[PDB]
Structure 1
Amino acid sequence: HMPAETVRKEVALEYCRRVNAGELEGVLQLFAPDARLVDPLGTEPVVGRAALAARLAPALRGAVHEEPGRPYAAHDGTSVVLPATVTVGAPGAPPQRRGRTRVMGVIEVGEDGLIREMRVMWGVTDSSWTARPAPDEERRKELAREHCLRINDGDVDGLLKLYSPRIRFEDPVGSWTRTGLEALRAHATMAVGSNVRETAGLTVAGQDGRHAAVTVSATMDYLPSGPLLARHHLMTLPAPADPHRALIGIEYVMVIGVDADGLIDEMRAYWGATDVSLLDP
């Protein structure tokens, strides 16, 4: 039996706390012995505690500081996503030569609560270490926001133009994969019919020429989603007295992957029961 959503959220924030405390050993104890770290996306994984120590020690020596945002869960018993800002320099650099990077970390926690995998999404356009251009990263972050805009405008035909016929999507992570534009059309049609509104917060790109992610605050009519969420352990609040007036709120992170033609061919949404609220009335 897998760690509760709130426990996985605790582990993600604890990682930041132990990094911040400068505790190399303490940090390492949070990871499984054979854990994998990918940072940034589009690099070889670091594998195992010896390798992780080699990777983290220089950052600890550079007084790395991590300022976490809000964590998001999933319905897979394992995943959690944490936006953060990370500041660091060479050992003993003044603030002048410390760079700051916006990231979103994806962690997969084991049954015992230890981190099995960590993938860190951030692009050059998310970091003060460089002003080099990366038009592709910007394009992908824009596409993530454009999804929300088209849903909000009720423009299902428009939304589908962003997507590949080969689109695989999963909502929430830990459900199942749906394939194809007609499935996306049905999902989007249900969203629009439920008065879904998707308000985007923060974006980051991955450095793999493929990924981007956006934080989203959504609302929608309590019916029909609420009773379905309740039945599948995704809404643990009491039912509203009048389901016809109530709204559901969901905080999530949407990760997208973009193909060789600039179309979105992968989409995942990270949220769980602890990310779901009820606006009643």
Structure 2
Amino acid sequence: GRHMPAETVRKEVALEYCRRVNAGELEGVLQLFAPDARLVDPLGTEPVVGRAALAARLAPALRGAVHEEPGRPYAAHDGTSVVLPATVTVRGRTRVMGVIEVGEDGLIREMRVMWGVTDSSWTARPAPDEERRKELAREHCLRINDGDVDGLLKLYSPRIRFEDPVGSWTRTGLEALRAHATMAVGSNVRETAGLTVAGQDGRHAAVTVSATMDYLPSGPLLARHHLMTLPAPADPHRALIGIEYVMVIGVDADGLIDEMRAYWGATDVSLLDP
């Protein structure tokens, strides 16, 4: 039997990575990675590949007493992804989001740590492109909230490929995105942006989102796709569904969003009644 690990298991592996970094025992940390795992930290630099090279990269950070304060982990429906915001202290405070893939043995196959110069207290180098990308991520949410579909599309390239949730079909083109946002507005979606980070690759950013929407039609639709399981609401005409997710965007050379992924799994959904 080979099987991909469940949402709950991936969430726990990401938290356990932080507990072991904090406990300071390098061998404990390394045993959480696959033998040929890849680490990219920060996003934009060369991958560190395999446990030997990971030992070389992490050894100094553990000697300097790095500390990772985990936030809330987010899953997906691809059997592998988990996203964990954290605050990393060492002088310095950095806000990061680790995008992690857990493999079939329960071990981290891959870890991509998104954080920019502008998410970090230990460097004051300016990165106006970072701030522009984070502001585009936030902007997506404001334009959904305001019911401004035409405006939302203005942020996106005609080449846009998006996946929501991670683990479903990749959708392409402004027409598919238009249809999503038009439905969100019809279900009174409200997206409240929390933490933002940027990559240092001239391209990525990410935002935690807390979203509410009308129970009808999304709840029964999504339950029937086996994407969530909620209790039955006392009043389905008034109830709301909450989804906590992280949206990752990729921005092209022209400043337009050409890639977008929303990370949430069944364990990131809830019924708000009322």
TM-score by length of 2: 0.98
Q: 1:210 & 1:237 partners in 2: Cα distance?
A: 36
Distance 1:110 1:232 in 2: 24
Show the counterpart of 2:217.
Answer: 224
Deviations 1:191-250, CA, capped at 9 Å, x for gaps: 100100000001000000000000000000111111122122222222223321111000
- The CA distance in 1 between the partners of 2:230 and 2:158, in whole Å, is 37
> How far off its partner does 1:100 sit?
1.1
Structure 2 residue 51 is the aligned partner of structure 1 residue 49: yes
CA distances 1:50-93 after superposition (whole Å, capped 9, x unpaired): 010001001001110000000000010100000001011xxxxx
| 3-state SS of 2:216 partner | coil
Counterpart Cα distance in 2 of 1:150 and 1:277: 24
SS in 2 for 1:120: strand
- Which secondary structure state, in structure 2, belongs to the residue aligned with residue 50 of structure 1? helix
Give me the whole-angstrom Cα distance separating, in 2, the residues matched to 1:234 and 1:222.
14
- Verify the 8 A CA contact 1:234 1:276 in the aligned structure 2: no
Distance across 2 between alignment mates of 1:204 and 1:161? 22
Q: Give the drift of 1:129.
A: 1.1
Q: Look up the SS of the partner of 1:67 in the other structure.
A: strand
| Structure 1 SS opposite 2:165 | coil
Query: Unaligned regions of 5+ residues in structure 1, if any?
Result: 89-97
Equivalent pairs counted in the alignment come to: 272
- Secondary structure at the aligned position of 1:11 is classed as helix
| 1:101-158 C-alpha deviation (Å, 9 max, x unpaired) | 0000011001121100000000000001111110000000000000000000000000
Distance 1:42 1:222 in 2: 40
Per-residue deviation, residues 7-52 of structure 1 (Å, max 9, x unmatched): 1010000000000000100000001111110111111111111010
Partners of 2:5 and 2:224 in 1: CA distance: 20
In 2: Cα distance, 1:136 partner to 1:10 partner: 34
Q: Which runs of 4+ in 1 moved over 4 A?
A: none
Give yes or no for contact 1:256–1:268 (8 Å, CA) kept in 2: yes
Deviates more, 1:29-38 or 1:232-241: 232-241
What's the CA shift for 1:165? 0.4
TM-aligned CA deviation for residue 255 of structure 1: 0.4
CA distance in 2, matches of 1:176, 1:43: 29
Match of 2:221, SS state, is helix
Residue 235 of structure 2 is aligned to residue 242 of structure 1 = yes
The CA RMSD over aligned residues, in Å, is 0.8
Task: Summarize the alignment of residues 20-31 of structure 1 with structure 2, pairs less than 5 Å apart.
Answer: 20-31=22-33
Inter-partner Cα distance in structure 2 for 1:45 and 1:232: 36
Matched, 1:278 2:265: no
Secondary structure at 1:148's aligned position in 2?
Answer: helix
The answer (yes or no) to whether the contact 1:246–1:279 under 8 Å persists in 2 is yes
In 2, the alpha carbon distance for the partners of 1:189 and 1:236 equals 24
Match of 2:196 in 1: 203
Uncovered stretches (5+) of structure 2, i.e. residues with no partner: none
1:166 to 140, 150, 159: 159
User: Following the alignment from structure 1 to structure 2, what is the Cα–Cα distance between the partners of residues 24 and 134?
Assistant: 33
What TM-score do the two structures reach when normalised by structure 1? 0.95
Matches within 5 A, 1:106-255: 106-255=99-248
C-alpha separation in 1, matches of 2:177 and 2:159? 11
Distance in structure 1 (CA, Å) of the matches to 2:113 and 2:68 = 13
